[PDB]
Amino acid sequence: APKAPADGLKMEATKQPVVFNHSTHKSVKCGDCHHPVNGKEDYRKCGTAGCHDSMDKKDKSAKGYYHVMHDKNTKFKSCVGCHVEVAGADAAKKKDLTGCKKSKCHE
Ligand code: HEM
Numbered sequence: 649a650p651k652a653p654a655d656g657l658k659m660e661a662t663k664q665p666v667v668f669n670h671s672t673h674k675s676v677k678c679g680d681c682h683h684p685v686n687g688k689e690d691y692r693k694c695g696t697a698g699c700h701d702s703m704d705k706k707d708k709s710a711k712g713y714y715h716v717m718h719d720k721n722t723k724f725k726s727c728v729g730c731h732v733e734v735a736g737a738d739a740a741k742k743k744d745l746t747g748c749k750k751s752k753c754h755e
């Protein structure tokens with residue numbers, strides 16, 4: 649069994665790094681993120697060669713690194729997509745979880 653890394657994983661392929669914590673996501677199945685590939689949950693870095701390596705943010709197909717972290721209507725849920733769903737219409741949760749600035753994700 650794969651073990652979940654500690655907290656404080658820095659995601660830094662772009663100019664706006666974000667910190668991922670496995671602890672605050674304990675209510676999500678590993679599989680909602682480390683999703684099935686060729687019938688089998690894949691645990692390599694999202695941005696691996698042949699995976700979401702398209703660094704062109706005005707690129708909307710399955711390969712886009714920006715797309716998979718922010719887009720709605722994606723087969724598996726993006727960071728922003730699932731957060732929009734958790735926040736509902738609560739203004740405080742929308743700012744912390746879905747805000748583009750001054751949120752838990754981006755300064
Ligand atoms: C519409 C709302 C948002 C805007 C406009 C925004 C904008 C951006 C931009 C411009 C970048 C850098 C992409 C590059 O230059 O190639 C980025 C990266 C990123 N954003 Fe956002 N962001 C938003 C909200 C959020 C939130 C709330 C989350 C998390 C739940 C988040 C997760 C990320 C991730 C994980 C990265 C990539 C980190 C890296 O590897 O450097 N974003 N975002």
Ligand code: HEM
Binds near residue numbers: 650668679
């Ligand atoms: C016990 C539960 C889970 C397992 C076993 C697990 C395991 C892992 C492992 C082994 C890595 C490091 C991979 C690498 O850098 O080689 C990883 C990274 C990370 N995990 Fe998970 N995780 C689980 C749940 C989650 C969930 C629910 C999500 C989000 C809600 C998540 C999102 C990520 C992200 C985005 C990374 C960093 C990927 C990269 O740096 O590109 N994980 N986790």
Ligand code: HEM
Binds near residue numbers: 699726
């Ligand atoms: C934490 C890890 C990862 C994240 C956050 C992530 C995110 C996503 C999202 C949101 C989608 C749907 C895109 C859309 O519908 O347009 C997707 C699909 C896809 N991703 Fe990932 N991904 C990760 C890891 C991987 C890696 C390592 C691979 C390659 C082995 C991979 C290959 C694919 C493929 C092939 C698709 C289409 C899946 C299908 O059509 O069943 N993903 N991913």
Ligand code: HEM
Binds near residue numbers: 667730
């Ligand atoms: C790369 C992956 C994503 C990013 C970067 C990310 C970022 C984080 C952030 C920064 C927090 C606030 C707590 C802390 O700082 O750790 C958090 C909260 C959480 N996220 Fe994510 N998230 C991601 C994926 C998603 C997805 C895909 C889901 C589930 C499908 C989700 C569900 C939640 C929930 C339920 C919480 C707790 C909200 C509450 O305590 O306020 N997240 N996320």
